[PDB]
Amino acid sequence: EYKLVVLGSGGVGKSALTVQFVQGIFVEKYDPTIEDSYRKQVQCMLEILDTAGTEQFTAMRDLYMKNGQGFALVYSITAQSTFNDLQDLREQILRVKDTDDVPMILVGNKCDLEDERVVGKEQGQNLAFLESSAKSKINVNEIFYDLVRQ
Amino acid sequence: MRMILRKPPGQRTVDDLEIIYDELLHIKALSHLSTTVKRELAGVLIFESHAKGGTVLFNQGEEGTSWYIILKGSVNVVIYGKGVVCTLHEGDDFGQLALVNDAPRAASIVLREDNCHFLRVDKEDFNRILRDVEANTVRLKEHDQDVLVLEKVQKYTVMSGTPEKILEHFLETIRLEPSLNEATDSVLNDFVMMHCVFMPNTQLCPALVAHYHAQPSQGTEQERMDYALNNKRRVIRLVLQWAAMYGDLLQEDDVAMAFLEEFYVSVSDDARMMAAFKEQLPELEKIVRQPIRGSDEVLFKVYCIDHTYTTIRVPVAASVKEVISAVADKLGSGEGLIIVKMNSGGEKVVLKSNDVSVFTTLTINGRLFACPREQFDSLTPLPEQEGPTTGTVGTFELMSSKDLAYQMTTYDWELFNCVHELELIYHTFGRHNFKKTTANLDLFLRRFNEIQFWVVTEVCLCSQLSKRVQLLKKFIKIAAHCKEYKNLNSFFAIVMGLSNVAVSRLALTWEKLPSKFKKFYAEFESLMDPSRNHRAYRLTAAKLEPPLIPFMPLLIKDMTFTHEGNKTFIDNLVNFEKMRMIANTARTVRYYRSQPFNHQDVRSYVRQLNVIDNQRTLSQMSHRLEP
Numbered sequence A: 001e002y003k004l005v006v007l008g009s010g011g012v013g014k015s016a017l018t019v020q021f022v023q024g025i026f027v028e029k030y031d032p033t034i035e036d037s038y039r040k041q042v043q044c045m046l047e048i049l050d051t052a053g054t055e056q057f058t059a060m061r062d063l064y065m066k067n068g069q070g071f072a073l074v075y076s077i078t079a080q081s082t083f084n085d086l087q088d089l090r091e092q093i094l095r096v097k098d099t100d101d102v103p104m105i106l107v108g109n110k111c112d113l114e115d116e117r118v119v120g121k122e123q124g125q126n127l128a129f130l131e132s133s134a135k136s137k138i139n140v141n142e143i144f145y146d147l148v149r150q
Numbered sequence B: 001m002r003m004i005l006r007k008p009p010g011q012r013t014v015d016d017l018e019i020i021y022d023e024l025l026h027i028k029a030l031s032h033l034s035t036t037v038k039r040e041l042a043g044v045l046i047f048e049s050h051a052k053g054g055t056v057l058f059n060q061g062e063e064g065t066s067w068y069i070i071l072k073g074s075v076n077v078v079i080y081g082k083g084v085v086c087t088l089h090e091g092d093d094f095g096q097l098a099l100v101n102d103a104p105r106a107a108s109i110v111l112r113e114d115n116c117h118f119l120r121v122d123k124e125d126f127n128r129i130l131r132d133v134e135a136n137t138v139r140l141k142e143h144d145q146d147v148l149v150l151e152k153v154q155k156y157t158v159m160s161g162t163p164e165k166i167l168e169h170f171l172e173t174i175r176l177e178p179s180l181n182e183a184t185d186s187v188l189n190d191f192v193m194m195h196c197v198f199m200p201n202t203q204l205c206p207a208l209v210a211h212y213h214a215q216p217s218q219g220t221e222q223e224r225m226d227y228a229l230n231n232k233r234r235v236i237r238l239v240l241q242w243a244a245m246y247g248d249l250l251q252e253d254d255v256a257m258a259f260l261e262e263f264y265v266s267v268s269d270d271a272r273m274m275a276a277f278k279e280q281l282p283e284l285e286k287i288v289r290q291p292i293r294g295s296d297e298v299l300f301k302v303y304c305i306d307h308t309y310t311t312i313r314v315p316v317a318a319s320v321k322e323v324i325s326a327v328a329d330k331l332g333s334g335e336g337l338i339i340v341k342m343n344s345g346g347e348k349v350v351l352k353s354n355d356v357s358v359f360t361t362l363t364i365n366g367r368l369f370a371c372p373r374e375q376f377d378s379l380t381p382l383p384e385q386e387g388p389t390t391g392t393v394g395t396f397e398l399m400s401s402k403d404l405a406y407q408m409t410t411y412d413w414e415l416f417n418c419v420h421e422l423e424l425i426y427h428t429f430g431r432h433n434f435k436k437t438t439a440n441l442d443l444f445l446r447r448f449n450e451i452q453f454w455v456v457t458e459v460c461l462c463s464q465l466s467k468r469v470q471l472l473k474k475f476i477k478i479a480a481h482c483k484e485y486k487n488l489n490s491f492f493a494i495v496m497g498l499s500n501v502a503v504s505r506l507a508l509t510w511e512k513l514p515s516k517f518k519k520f521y522a523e524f525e526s527l528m529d530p531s532r533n534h535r536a537y538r539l540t541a542a543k544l545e546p547p548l549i550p551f552m553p554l555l556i557k558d559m560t561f562t563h564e565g566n567k568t569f570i571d572n573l574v575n576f577e578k579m580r581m582i583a584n585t586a587r588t589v590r591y592y593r594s595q596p597f598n599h600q601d602v603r604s605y606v607r608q609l610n611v612i613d614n615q616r617t618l619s620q621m622s623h624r625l626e627p
């Protein structure tokens, strides 16, 4: 059993990544109201705790942080302000879990569209790092592989 | 051979059956079927011939009795208001939809040429042989363009289609029989609720008018008058269900109100003339904390960088563009203002001109600012945003846990009932796509945060350790009573307030708490377990009877993932499967409110909370209470 958490600001692609990993957009209908909605077997079972849709409810991310074992800090390369928002979420994990180090992955979503990029690759590596895309299936599975290793 | 095929089922010989079967292997419409089915069909397929082109096989609206296969010739598919929509040729089959779904004929079948031969299977023979094995899909085409897709999920249900065809389908299949009242309304509910996404009133109302006046092109004078009457009856039924969904929200829609006005006159004029609609006419006549409307006007304060403000008078559903305009009108501007939300914590969000009804989307202590873009980074929060500096224990400590929880639940229910089902739809699909407010949902969702931060505020403002232990005990008690009233929302809000980093830190306070309440809380916190899609909560809420308030953040999550996880359109057709899923979630809210729920000072406190929502301040306060 493993519990992984997806974090980030609104309009970043959190829900798109979650669905695209557990099942897949279009190929099958997505029911988020059943027991195995966010669970996928890879040989071990993973549960994705995504904060998408519940960002205004701070208690929701805190609950997911306490129960989480791996963390995915996601931002958009088309949105300048979204990379800035990651510093707070980073420190909040160490605060809720009350630990020195936490297994986490840094994710730069929406890497498929370059003609709208305002956030270069530069900034990511300095703070593992991936440039992924949910709608283009780039590095979707890879994100959640790192966390199980860590 | 055709004489053989003219013989009734129980009159064909063994050699007759054996020779018919041999020929059925050449018919393409039957080739996917088993030998078992084909052998049974050999004793059931009736041969039918008609001489003249233009002969009507059956009318749209008639009850279905037979399934047909074309041996020779061709037919036209005729729908009222559209004419010839499709042509069928040698090898093709039709008339299965009415038989399987127990619905009226969706179209008329008219002979296209002279001398057409058919194979026919009657109703009861079709049901025992073909119904269970026929096919999973029916694709309806009009002008060689995909228009409706029906599948087995047992009947063929709508999976996808054009807005016009989906409307046509749900209009046609309405059952007027009084004993089928709830079944009819239940079937229509998905369309009536979800039409705002794929067929707004601007398109729906003219389509409704056109359907109401659409006369039949086939049949005797009596058959035609009977169909048109029943057509009109079904349109009225749909209109009534449509109007009921909106309720008071019709006042926000000029097109919808103008439609109803003229529709009522049309129906009443037809009622007088035809002596009909005796039950439905008075129903239509009736239609022709309190919930906030989009048209309501608010006095709202928009702040300048120097912390002065303008008071604007605008509608609740006003766009940011309209807000900017109202501010500019008072300050006399031409300096390129932008609207920005600011937290008590100082973090800022720039709003697009596109955004509608933003007033209620603010955080508990959020404020709205108007400034040129170069001022964005220099903006700083107001003192008013930073919350109280002295607690209110001396007031609510004198109040009972049961009294507080009850007044909380009463207030919560007033806020919950103010939320219209459609606000859930507008919130999910994007507020700007409808130009409608979600103010009521906005305020009820914020209430979750208000209760959560109330707990943290009072604990962090309580300097005495002994009194602080008393607070923890009281909050656990209030939470327990909230769960008793089936107010799960406020229950989780208190539990999560206790879970907050600033409160859980207080080891000396938790340690000194009686083990009776320590285990009580651990049981509460275990209900929050996110495991197996919040299974612990899911089962808890399912066992309860239907006067309850659900865990709202999870509902919003369900709605979000239903939207992002599914495409609204597939191949330019409306994905009605998705629409059905959204409607199911909304109906769950309808189920929770389907039953009613059963001390001015206690009422006053609960409804007028002053809260710190600045997490930094709360942590700093907690760090000096217990270093």
Ligand SMILES: CO[C@@H]1[C@@H]2OP(=O)(O)OC[C@H]2O[C@H]1n1c(Sc2ccc(Cl)cc2)nc2c(N)ncnc21
Pocket: B064, B077, B085, B086, B088, B093, B094, B095, B096, B097, B098, B099, B104, B105, B106, B107, B108, B109, B137, B138, B139, B140, B141, B142, B147
């Ligand atoms: C499945 O057969 C359909 C209808 O079934 P029914 O029993 O409602 O009677 C009219 C029949 O015409 C056929 N039909 C057709 S032709 C057809 C289409 C699909 C199949 Cl599997 C068989 C025939 N096109 C239609 C349309 N655009 N709207 C409504 N009905 C259409």
